[PDB]
Amino acid sequence: SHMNKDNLRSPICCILGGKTKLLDKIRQTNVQAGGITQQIGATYFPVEAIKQKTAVVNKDGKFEFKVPGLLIIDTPGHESFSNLRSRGSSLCNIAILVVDIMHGLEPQTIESLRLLRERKTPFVVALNKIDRLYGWKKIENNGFRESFALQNKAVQNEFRNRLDQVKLQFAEQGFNSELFYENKNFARYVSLVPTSAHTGEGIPDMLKLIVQLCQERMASSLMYLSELQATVLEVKAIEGFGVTIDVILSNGILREGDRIVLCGLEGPIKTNIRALLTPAPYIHHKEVKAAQGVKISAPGLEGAIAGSRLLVVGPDDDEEELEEEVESDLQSLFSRVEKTGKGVSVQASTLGSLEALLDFLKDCKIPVANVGIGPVYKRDVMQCGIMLEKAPDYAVMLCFDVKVDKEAQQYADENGIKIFTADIIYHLFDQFTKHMQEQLEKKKEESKMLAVFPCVLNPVAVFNKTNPIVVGVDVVDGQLKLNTPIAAVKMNPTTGQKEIISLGRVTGIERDHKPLQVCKKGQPAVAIKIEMGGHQPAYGRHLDEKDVLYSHISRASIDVLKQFYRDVVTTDEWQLIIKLKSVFDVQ
Question: What residue spans carry the region label G5?
């Protein structure tokens, strides 16, 4: 239908990855009426081109276009998600993930999927390589449904089978998917678009779907507007122009000489546009209009942050207010730290990658104490260092797609700071959890050593005076367990101070040559072997049979029992613990 002023500016979409073949098949045209533009970091398709490439799925012409063009960003990475999520449409309105129908779902696609869901970016899936089905009769550049009706029962069955299998793969990952012309709810179901970059089959359906979804669901995003919308897509060093910035012009005009402000590493950048560059069939322009992928040459773009907004200062404008306004996003990222001061340190390459890392970590309930953009330096590493006292566990850095300075790494190694780096978030999660697992295992072993049960031992005999010590004792109170540290306690009458004598830990308990694990009170005497790595005091020289022996409990020891063994320990054992607190001078 037609509503009053229902026409919208051209939407932006990107493909992530069989990707390159697919983009190549899309760009393919016999026209040289048609017309397709190559832009900096992108490819523009005028409406006529789309009409042409969608005609076969639109025989009647009933589908109405309300956009002038489609802009497709072609980058090898996540550049279309460099800005903050709120502003995301400025870089991308909708994405496409490519999945080999022959080979099924793959890890990379799953990562992109999770990231896409996290950013709340709308997307569709191109189910590629359908010509590889056994018995596929291809019709070049035909609509999918059409070619599908022309197939034999066996190949229709093969397609249905492989489709059910891929759907099952999506399901096993927590994604609901449906063939696009069978999708009842786009909000809850991923759309599947069968494609063939080889034969061009499915592609018209796919373009028409992109445009349709953008027109019917994102019209609010795409409305003509008065203000400038320009976003830094990339930062690229170019010979003859130094460090340039690649900008996506969503809306409005840019001119040579314009005063511009943007987010920099060390703070707001104020500069002038030396040159507006487009790819050679580089050609300079006095000005550019949306929708445009444009390169910008200007002094002082070193340390420009990808994902930053581009702001042009008019004569009647406050430059400083615009600086604040453009640094505000990055600042809103910086303010995302725990007030407790306990947490890990993160570093990310762009605004959006940082926001994504922070959103993910927050969702994983992992505390962050320090955040930053760009390469890692010693200073960052020290701020992390504070963690070592504050929280030993959290003294690690999660670094996404960012270089690590030699001295930073050196200081880190010297001080026990772990710097984890990855070009994918979930791997940073992996390294972190591995680290925490190690720390816990360490803690559980230290706890095991400290799990001392209470006992009092009365010596009946001495069999080996030392190295190891072997004594026949009577368990008069509590229970003696293996690995119990044993101490004697002697009071000097003159000094009035106690002399604690540690004997080591019980490695063997035996009655009449029979092995025993424990010996409770009242049970007959036992011979116990107490050995320690350190030199062990001789019974004859510093000891007497007369001297009584107690389980060497510690305040640390007592704490461990309360924390984990409360279910296990008895009441009389607790009383004995208190008495022993008295004997070992413990508060």
Answer: 196-198
